[PDB]
Amino acid sequence: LINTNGSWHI
């Protein structure tokens, strides 16, 4: 799980 613009995605 990585975070982009304060949101976590996979």
Epitope: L1, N3, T4, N5, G6, S7, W8, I10
Partner: antibody, heavy 118, light 110 residues
Amino acid sequence: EVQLSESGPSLVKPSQTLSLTCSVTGDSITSGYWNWIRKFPGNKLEYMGYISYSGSTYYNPSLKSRISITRDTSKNQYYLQLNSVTTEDTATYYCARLYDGYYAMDYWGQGTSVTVSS
Amino acid sequence: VLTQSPASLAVSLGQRATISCRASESVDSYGNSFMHWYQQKPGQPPKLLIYLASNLESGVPARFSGSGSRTDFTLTIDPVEADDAATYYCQQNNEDPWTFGGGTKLEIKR
């Protein structure tokens, strides 16, 4: 012993630029997320932003106009810059590490007081 | 937005303490709750107590406990000790913006 040490001026004149440095010893900023947080004198906490293991960044929206976070992995430091400060920006500033398994801020520095005044 | 309740609170040695964190919107995603708890005393940085809603940080006594739903969370100290006098903050990083709760100051009643 992951450990973080902030540094920078104690006193800044309004409309100048705030420049703080977090020096990290005890693991590498090659990995993990590296954040900036400030605590106002009323004792409220406010998240400011981070720079990640890959160099991407994320900033609080109430700051986007004037905040910049960068890093120097060979020194193992990363840096805050906040342009055009006012008295509202008087706070205790902390840097802190966040990591992948935990997704929470687990190592803090002691904090550095910064006053914006003429 | 995160609202804590109460803003102050008093507890005798050995009783149960319950601090509440209210969320404006669901902070769940990918099976975890992105909700954490921090203790802070004057002159010191915040200290992580509970990460991911219910997981105890190592180094922290088992007297501290965390438990929470998508938008309602709670922190529990049982039994409270003299050392537990501090201010407790909840923080959310599910989605933009990352924000802290207003804070809850715990007083030990003697």
